[PDB]
Design an enzyme around this catalytic site. Structure first.
Site, PDB file in Angstrom:
ATOM      1  CG  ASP A  35      -1.869   1.184   1.252  1.00 54.36           C
ATOM      2  OD1 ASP A  35      -1.957   1.883   0.229  1.00 54.36           O
ATOM      3  OD2 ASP A  35      -2.518   1.405   2.308  1.00 54.36           O
ATOM      4  CB  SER A 199      -2.019  14.085 -13.772  1.00 62.15           C
ATOM      5  OG  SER A 199      -2.364  13.810 -15.122  1.00 62.15           O
TER       6      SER A 199
END
Ligand code: 5HL
Length: 330
Positions: A35, A199
């Site tokens: 994780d 992004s």
């Protein structure tokens, strides 16, 4: 040193991935959820309330000759989805795919929430976010990666998740045969303890690319892709019959649909998520309404590049003094 381990989807939907981890002496092998969105290595154990264990493999520290109770140490964590677990702490030897750390904090669960009990395939989590998020009290503990970092050939790990198929976590090296083209690196903020990056935009199917900054985290422990409502609306608008369902808690679509791809930007580079990766199957057994793999982040407070996005890429988690993230197509 290096390590390399295969990671395997837990079910037919890729809801999560498990990777075998050796703990203790002699080794006890548990299948852990790696994780990158959290920083505790915790396991089901002999100390877990018996009624809260249903099929998981447990760690029994009393049978490990290298286990030592970390005196006075406790942990307690709550995840974005409302699940939780808590307990005490041992140090022990932990190996992943041939890479060994001695004195790793292994957090033994005394209590876990229902969702963990109900998932017999996940024996615990191995956190790979930054150690500043580790919940051990009163003395915060380091992640497996932080402990191994100095010994690694290069201070990196890579995630190569499969679509309906096994993949690989590598520590300490970049497998240049595992991706196509080049790896584009992008800046990371560690201010919230996550692998947080920005992004450069998106496209839906064959549509034109929209240049827009999308801050979010690279999170292997989240199944789906969570993005701003404007973006998600633009995606599902291209799917006939798709709608956001309040009762189901997200966008659903007719199971008979062919889904468009979704592209995200990493600098000037582009990662394409095939439409099939966005299909998470019937909302309930036998239903012809299917759950979408791209959902709104509104009300989460952060965008999450979870498995849906990450599995479309070869992803480098660069733990150099100034951390960065790398993405390549594959
Ligand atoms: C991958 C997630 C996923 C897959 C497949 C089906 C579902 C269905 C639901 C909605 N059920 C809640 C409202 C009772 C959901 O939230 N996540 C799903």
């Amino acid at each position: 040193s290096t390590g390399s381990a295969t990671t395997t989807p837990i079910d037919s939907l890729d809801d999560a991935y498990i990777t075998p981890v050796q703990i203790g002496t002699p080794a006890q092998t548990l299948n852990l959820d790696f994780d990158t969105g959290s920083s505790d290595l915790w396991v089901f154990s002999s100390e877990t309330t018996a009624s809260e264990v249903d099929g998981q493999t447990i760690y029994t520290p009393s049978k490990s000759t290298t286990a030592k109770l970390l005196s006075g140490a406790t942990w307690s964590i709550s995840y974005g989805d409302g699940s939780s677990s808590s307990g005490d702490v041992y140090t022990d030897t932990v190996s992943v795919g041939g890479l060994t750390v001695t004195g790793q904090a292994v957090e033994s669960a005394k209590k876990v929430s229902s969702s963990f009990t109900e998932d017999s395939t996940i024996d615990g989590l191995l956190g790979l976010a930054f150690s500043t998020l580790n919940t051990v009290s009163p003395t915060q503990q380091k992640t497996f990666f932080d402990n191994a970092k100095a010994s690694l050939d290069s201070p990196v790990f890579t995630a190569d998740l499969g679509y309906h198929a096994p993949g690989t976590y590598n520590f300490g090296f970049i497998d240049t045969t595992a991706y196509t083209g080049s790896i584009t690196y992008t800046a990371v903020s560690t201010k919230q303890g996550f692998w947080e990056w920005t992004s450069t935009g998106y496209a839906v199917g064959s549509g034109t690319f929209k240049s827009t900054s999308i801050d979010g985290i690279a999170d292997t422990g989240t199944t789906l892709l969570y993005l701003p409502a404007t973006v998600v609306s633009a995606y599902w608008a291209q799917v006939s019959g798709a709608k956001s369902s309040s009762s189901v808690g997200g966008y659903v679509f007719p199971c008979s649909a062919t889904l468009p791809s979704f592209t995200f930007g990493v600098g000037s580079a582009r990662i394409v998520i095939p439409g099939d990766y966005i299909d998470f199957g019937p909302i309930s057994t036998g239903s012809s309404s299917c759950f979408g793999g791209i959902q709104s982040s509104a009300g989460i407070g952060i965008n999450i590049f979870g498995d849906v996005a990450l599995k479309a890429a070869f992803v480098v988690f660069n733990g150099a003094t100034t951390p960065t993230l790398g993405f390549a197509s594959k």
